């Protein structure tokens, strides 16, 4: 779903790098996919694409499927990767990731 929003080579490359289960790192992915260098405004648009809503939240079970926003049939994150990802991103501690959580995490 990031067709036109991020570089296709970047998306491919970010996915390639975490293809093996338990090899994902969100800080690595954000940089490689090209999100970290975007402005907070474009980071917000990226959130919207993923949560399907600027006011939405990414829940744990949806966070598990993070990669599949960039390539439909990418692997699922393992439960370990999801837990690590959620815990780093969920600053406001509601057990999920909203737009504020997200924007801070990408720019971190």
* Site residues for its own copies per CB under 8 A: 17-18, 20, 22-25, 27-28, 31-32
Site for Mg ion in 46-85 (CB under 5 A): none
Decide which of Mg ion, its own copies, none touches 62; Cβ closer than 5 to 8 Å per partner kind.
Answer: none
Strand partners, 97: 58
Q: Are strands 57-58 and 97-98 parallel, antiparallel or unpaired?
A: antiparallel
For Mg ion, the binding residue among 30, 90, 99, 102 (CB under 5 A) is 90
Question: How many Cβ atoms are within 10 Å of 91's Cβ, its own excluded?
Answer: 15
Site size for Mg ion (CB under 5 A): 5
Angle at 31 between CA 27 and CA 37, to 5 degrees: 120
Decide which of its own copies, Mg ion, none touches 68; Cβ closer than 5 to 8 Å per partner kind.
Answer: none
């Amino acid at each position: 779903a990031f067709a036109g929003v991020l570089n296709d080579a970047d998306i491919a490359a970010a996915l390639e790098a975490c293809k093996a289960a338990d090899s994902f790192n969100h800080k690595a992915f954000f940089a490689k996919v090209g999100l970290t260098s975007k402005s907070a405004d474009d980071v917000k648009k990226a959130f919207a694409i993923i949560a399907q809503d600027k006011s939405g939240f990414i829940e744990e079970d949806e966070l598990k499927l993070f990669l599949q926003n960039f390539k439909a049939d990418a692997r699922a994150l393992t439960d370990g990767e999801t837990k690590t990802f959620l815990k780093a991103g969920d600053s406001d501690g509601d057990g999920k990731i909203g737009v504020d959580d997200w924007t801070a995490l990408v720019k971190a």
